[PDB]
Amino acid sequence: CSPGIWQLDCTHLEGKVILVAVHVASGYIEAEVIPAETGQETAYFLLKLAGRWPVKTVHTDNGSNFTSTTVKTACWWAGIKQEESMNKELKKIIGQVRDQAEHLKTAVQMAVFIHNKKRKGYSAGERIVDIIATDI
Amino acid sequence: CSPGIWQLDCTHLEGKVILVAVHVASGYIEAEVIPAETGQETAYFLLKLAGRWPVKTVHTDNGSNFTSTTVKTACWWAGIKQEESMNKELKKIIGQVRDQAEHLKTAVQMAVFIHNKKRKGYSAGERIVDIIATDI
Ligand SMILES: Cn1c([C@H](OC(C)(C)C)C(=O)O)c(-c2ccc3c(c2)CCCO3)c2ccccc21
Ligand SMILES: Cn1c([C@H](OC(C)(C)C)C(=O)O)c(-c2ccc3c(c2)CCCO3)c2ccccc21
Structure with missing residues (x-):
């Protein structure tokens, strides 16, 4: 997949919104808890x-x-x-680590950490940097 | 400088706080407007x-x-x-583009865009990915 392609969606949990962005070629994730599925937050x-x-x-x-x-x-x-x-x-990971944190957003970021770092033999964190670098 | 060294400080503007993180080897910036210079935000x-x-x-x-x-x-x-x-x-860049946006945080992110992208002959955006990739 082209190096600069991203996917963006919202999933919900505990009545709060999670903006989730995925670099399609690598599987690397950036996520953020937002209060409202509004266009201002997406912008x-x-x-x-x-x-x-x-x-x-x-x-x-x-x-x-x-x-x-x-x-x-x-x-x-x-x-x-x-x-x-x-x-x-x-x-899944959010669910696993949710008890370890008071706020949902702390768990969300913990889960992004785990996902980006766990080697799947590079990890998504490594694959994205590799791809974009090569593309240079 | 070692590839995994970062610098973190707060500067203030319009009575709001800006958390600023710099990848020292590359000059690449990540910034965020926070309401309070509290430890919860830094964490x-x-x-x-x-x-x-x-x-x-x-x-x-x-x-x-x-x-x-x-x-x-x-x-x-x-x-x-x-x-x-x-x-x-x-x-400087915030100052330049501040009029183009209602909120300070929009300008902050605009300035991060400009800084990371403007070639200085790579740009900080390119240098950071290069460094971390090489280090792999
Ligand atoms: C409220 N609170 C939190 C955490 O919320 C913030 C990070 C936004 C402050 C939360 O929701 O549980 C932390 C905390 C900080 C770091 C951290 C973790 C929890 C879990 C694993 C990853 O590292 C914390 C620590 C001492 C007192 C109060 C705290
Ligand atoms: C309030 N507001 C903003 C912008 O704030 C958010 C991005 C948080 C919504 C703000 O503070 O001026 C935008 C806007 C969106 C994109 C964008 C820019 C401004 C400037 C250059 C970069 O791209 C916008 C557009 C239509 C109506 C209302 C808007």
Whole structure:
């Protein structure tokens, strides 16, 4: 898969929203707990993601996610164009480590840590950096 | 500089706090607007950062930043150990693009985008991925 392709969806838990971004070629995840599945949060998140990685295209399982003017604006400024078990495993790990933390967001980040680091023989963390580097 | 060394400080603007993390070998930045210079925010931020990069050691210009139990806990779980003009330039870019955005945090992320991407002949975005990849 092209190095700059990302997938973006929301899953819910404890009545809070989790924005989940996956680098499709590597399986590396960036996640964030947001209070509201609003376009403002998706725009802001896209801005951070594009700042830290080469984000060329973004796919989603809910196209209406990318429809507000706020989201379209972020995509415009950042040069972003429109176009799994990752979410299932992530929710598995969240479940496993949820007791170890008071807040859901702490567990969410713990699960991102585990997922990105556990070697599957590189780990998603290693594969993404490898891919993007090679592409340079 | 060792590939896994990071620097972490807070600067203030419009009466809000900006957590700024710099990968010392590359100059790549991750920033976030937080409401309160509290240890809970530093812990949470460290968790995200360690999830997405190899974070071995963290230096700061304010050691008391790393003193609360919440911060020490995040460092423990993540395997993190304790140990510029980057902040000045970042504040420059924020200033330049501040008018283009309602919220300070939107401008902060815009400035991170510019900084990470502008080639200085790679850009900080390219140098960090190169370094960490080579180190693999
Ligand atoms: C509230 N709280 C938390 C944690 O929330 C924040 C990180 C946002 C502060 C939470 O929801 O349980 C921590 C804590 C910090 C680090 C950390 C972990 C928990 C779990 C494993 C990974 O590393 C913590 C520590 C001392 C007092 C209070 C705390
Ligand atoms: C409030 N607001 C913002 C923006 O705040 C959020 C991103 C958090 C929603 C803000 O503070 O000005 C945007 C916006 C979205 C993208 C974007 C930019 C501004 C500037 C350049 C980079 O790309 C936006 C668009 C339509 C309506 C309302 C908006």
